Design an enzyme around this catalytic site. Structure first.
Site, PDB file in Angstrom:
ATOM      1  N   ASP A   1      26.615   1.685 106.321  1.00  0.00           N
ATOM      2  CA  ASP A   1      27.213   0.697 105.375  1.00  0.00           C
ATOM      3  C   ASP A   1      28.667   1.059 105.037  1.00  0.00           C
ATOM      4  OD1 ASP A   1      24.404  -0.071 105.097  1.00  0.00           O
ATOM      5  OD2 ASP A   1      25.000  -1.014 103.200  1.00  0.00           O
TER       6      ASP A   1
ATOM      7  N   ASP B   1      30.631  10.209  98.129  1.00  0.00           N
ATOM      8  CA  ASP B   1      29.684  10.347  97.030  1.00  0.00           C
ATOM      9  C   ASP B   1      28.245  10.377  97.505  1.00  0.00           C
ATOM     10  OD1 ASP B   1      29.027   7.658  97.502  1.00  0.00           O
ATOM     11  OD2 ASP B   1      29.134   7.072  95.362  1.00  0.00           O
TER      12      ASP B   1
ATOM     13  N   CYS C   1      26.178   5.108  93.404  1.00  0.00           N
ATOM     14  CA  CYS C   1      26.827   3.908  93.962  1.00  0.00           C
ATOM     15  C   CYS C   1      26.635   2.707  93.069  1.00  0.00           C
ATOM     16  CB  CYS C   1      26.150   3.562  95.298  1.00  0.00           C
ATOM     17  SG  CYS C   1      26.550   4.761  96.550  1.00  0.00           S
TER      18      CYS C   1
END
Ligand SMILES: [Cl-]
Ligand SMILES: [Cl-]
Ligand SMILES: [Cl-]
Ligand SMILES: [Mg+2]
Ligand code: NA
Ligand code: NA
Ligand code: NA
Length: 367
Positions: free
Chosen positions: A211, A217, A357
């Site tokens: 993605d 992160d 996220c």
């Protein structure tokens, strides 16, 4: 869209570390049927659980689309604020503003955005609403706004609040992001906007994290100045292993912005997870988003946790040793925080990310 005439740094602003004090957390609300199985319901309940956990530590606002506002308001406790906001998907770490402060003393950065790789490589084909999310959040709070023309997501950058910025090459040097800019130019803009002085570039992010093209992160984050938590496996047959070892090599030869050597704490990924046929079968294919296929390796890492005021909100993947290990390691690493696990975090990973996220911290405004 063009750039603010003066940068944050020229006004004394910088991005504080995530573990500094927050005024509140922002979170979006999932809905699109070609990314969230079963009409988004399983994911909505996990989002709600994440929001509710964070609300025990600090105020939370959830933003939901016009179609969803009543649904979100039902599913969330009353001390969570729910506001109406259009969006193409619900990843406020990435489409939301990156807040900055100075010793008005808080501002927000509105980066350009292209759904993690744009017309030819992004996660869906229309991000027009997403492009307004940062403006609307900052307008809601009456917080001033710096605007950049460069593409960036908050999930692609990590800071220690001491001048260091931790990033991945796989993401920020991808030709699907800012192919008109060099590495050096990207560095200069992040210095100007984040108030940082030096960088640690990991070549790659987490295995399976197609993605985002390897957002930092989901791979590695600071625990405090000079210390990082790194996604890890001891299994040489997992494609994650070569990425982790390469990051370790870089980090063990890295110096932060204040001259510290980096210490690395290994945070083991769960035993590999793969999307099931039953999961994939609940997701529509409307030709607007990337497909979600049975057998896909889930981009699952306990590094994608969120730090709140006195709380750590960590995913749990059902792994009969790695879930509790992650809670223990995080509890030892953040001994002044309460560590909360979020069961069924898999529901968020199915759609490309995790707790970190779907959050975006609003720092407390220094006085
Ligand atoms: Cl309650
Ligand atoms: Cl120190
Ligand atoms: Cl897939
Ligand atoms: Mg933006
Ligand atoms: Na994957
Ligand atoms: Na992508
Ligand atoms: Na299979």
């Amino acid at each position: 869209s063009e750039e603010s005439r003066e940068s944050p740094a020229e006004h004394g602003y910088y991005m504080p570390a995530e573990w500094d004090s927050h005024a509140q957390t922002w979170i979006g609300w999932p809905e699109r049927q070609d990314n969230w199985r079963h009409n988004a319901l399983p994911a909505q309940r996990v989002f709600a659980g994440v929001a509710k956990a964070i609300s025990k530590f600090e105020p939370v606002t959830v933003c939901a689309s016009p179609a969803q506002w009543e649904n979100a308001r039902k599913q969330l406790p009353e001390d969570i604020r729910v506001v109406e906001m259009s969006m193409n998907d619900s990843w406020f770490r990435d489409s939301g503003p990156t807040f900055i402060v100075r010793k008005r003393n808080i501002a927000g950065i509105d980066w350009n955005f292209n759904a993690w790789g744009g017309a030819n490589d992004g996660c869906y084909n229309d991000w027009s609403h997403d492009l307004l999310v940062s403006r609307k959040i900052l307008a809601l709070e009456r917080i001033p706004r710096f605007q950049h023309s460069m593409i960036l997501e908050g999930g692609s950058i990590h800071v220690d609040g001491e001048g260091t910025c931790l990033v991945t090459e796989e993401c920020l040097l991808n030709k699907n992001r800012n192919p008109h800019m060099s590495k050096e130019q990207i560095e200069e803009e992040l210095k100007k906007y984040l108030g940082v002085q030096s960088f640690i570039w990991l070549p790659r992010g987490l295995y399976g994290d197609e993605d985002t093209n390897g957002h930092i992160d989901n791979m590695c984050c600071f625990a405090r100045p000079g210390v990082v938590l790194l996604s890890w496996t001891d299994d040489e047959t997992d494609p994650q292993y070569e990425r982790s070892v390469e990051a370790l090599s870089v980090l063990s030869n890295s110096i932060d912005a204040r001259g510290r050597k980096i210490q690395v704490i290994k945070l083991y990924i769960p035993e590999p997870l793969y999307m099931t046929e039953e999961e994939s079968s609940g997701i529509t294919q409307d030709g607007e988003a990337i497909p979600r296929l049975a057998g896909t390796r889930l981009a699952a890492s306990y590094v994608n946790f969120y730090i709140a005021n006195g709380g750590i909100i960590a995913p749990q993947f059902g792994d009969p040793i790695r879930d509790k290990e992650a809670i223990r390691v995080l509890s030892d690493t953040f001994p002044h925080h309460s560590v909360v696990g979020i069961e069924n975090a898999r529901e968020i990973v199915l759609a490309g990310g995790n707790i970190h996220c779907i959050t975006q911290q609003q720092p407390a405004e220094p006085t």
